[PDB]
Amino acid sequence: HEIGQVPLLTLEEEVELARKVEEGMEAIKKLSEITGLDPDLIREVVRAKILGSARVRHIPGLKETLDPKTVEEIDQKLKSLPKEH
Amino acid sequence: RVEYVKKERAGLRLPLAAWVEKEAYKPGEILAELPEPYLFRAEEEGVVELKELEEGAFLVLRREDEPVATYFLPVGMTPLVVHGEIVEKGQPLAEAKGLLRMPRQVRAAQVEAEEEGETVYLTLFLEWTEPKDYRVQPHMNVVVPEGARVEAGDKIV
RNA sequence: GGGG
DNA sequence: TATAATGGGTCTGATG
DNA sequence: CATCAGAGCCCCAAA
């Protein structure tokens, strides 16, 4: 029943979502170059904020524990950038 | 649909007594009223380049392929020529029949009037929009908002 | 499935 | 690692 | 009026 709540994608929104996902993937590569941080770490912090404060945990593979404190520091180091970055 | 903004200069000859004087003409505004049919005649030699808008048309004579005259036919002007036609000087191009006025999708910036006997030759600084439609497909995405003024070479899709 |  | 594939197979007594 | 927990002992050969 829960699965039937989410409508099936049209060929357009199928390509749109798949497209936005691939662009976001590249936006974290180009974002680790600028910031000079770990790609994986960045992409996790991007997840922390989209999913919500319900999930927050130490992702084994990453080097810095993911407590609300260190995500806020990386969310500010992100917001600290010029409009073009 | 991209409403492309064109801004050129064009002319038109009317009976001086049928022409209402104004330093500009907003869309739909009356430009002249003729008590009888008056044949807007050609004043240059060349091959016609008809360009019909929504209402009202353009008409560009050329020698070789260099433009030599650009005429403007407002509403009320039925063109008596076809595209690519050869016109000798003085041959009637269109016909005005009573009230003629600017089309809705085009306006007159400046207006310059030279008088010559019982007529006026208007040099209208016209600016209008010519829409072109583009079909968009499922593999493609529109990267431009509604009302976004684009310059040449910009990406829309 | 039998015994008591 | 790439056709497309998108919703399963008795029998009684005490307690809320 | 529905849901859950009870409903004898020991022994054998089988599986």
What is the C-alpha separation between B138 and B157, in angstroms, rounded?
11
Residue A18's contacts (CB-CB under 8 Å, 6 or more residues apart) are none
What is the C-alpha separation between B139 and B80, in angstroms, rounded?
46
Instruction: Give me the residues of B, 105-144, that contact A with CB < 8 A.
Output: 138-139, 141
Torsion of CA B115, B116, B118, B123, to 10 degrees: -50
What is the DSSP code (8-state) at residue B62? Answer: E
Q: How long is the CA A1 to C1' E2 vector, in angstroms?
A: 27
**Least CA distance to B138: which residue of chain A?**
A12
Q: Does the distance separating the beta carbons of B141 and A19 come in below 8 Å?
A: yes
DSSP per residue, B64-121: TTEEEEEEEE-EEEEE---TT-EE-TT-EEEEEEEEEE--TTEEEEEEEEEE-SSEEE
What is the C-alpha separation between B38 and B21, in angstroms, rounded?
18
Under 8 Å between Cβ of B127 and B27: no
Residue B105's contacts (CB-CB under 8 Å, 6 or more residues apart) are B27, B53, B54, B55, B128, B129
Find the radius of gyration of the CA atoms of chain B.
18
Torsions phi, psi for B92 (to 5 deg): -65, 125
Under 8 Å between Cβ of B125 and B9: yes
Q: Does the distance separating the beta carbons of A11 and B138 come in below 8 Å?
A: yes
What is the C-alpha separation between A22 and A12, in angstroms, rounded?
15
**Least CA distance to A18: which residue of chain B?**
B139
Report the structure determination method: X-ray
CA nearest neighbour of B22 among B149, B139, B113: B113
Under 8 Å between Cβ of B70 and B46: no
CB burial string B124-145: b at 16+ within 10 A, e below: bebebeeeeeeeeeeeeeeeee
What is the C-alpha separation between A2 and A6, in angstroms, rounded?
8
CA angle B101, B103, B108 (to 5 degrees): 80
Instruction: Assess B145–A contact: CB distance below 8 Å, yes or no.
Output: no
Contacts of A16 in chain B (CB under 8 A): 141
Q: Which two tokens stand for residue B148?
A: 């976004």
**Least CA distance to A13: which residue of chain B?**
B138
Q: Which residues of chain A between 4 and 33 are close to nucleic strand D, CB under 7 A?
A: 4, 8-9, 14
Resolution in A: 3.0
End-to-end CA distance of chain A: 42
Under 8 Å between Cβ of B14 and B98: no
What is the DSSP code (8-state) at residue B35? Answer: S
- To the nearest whole Å, the CA of A10 is away from the closest chain B CA by 9
What residues are paired with B36 via a beta bridge? Answer: none
Which nt has its C1' nearest the CA of A9? D6
What residues are paired with B54 via a beta bridge? Answer: none
End-to-end CA distance of chain B: 12
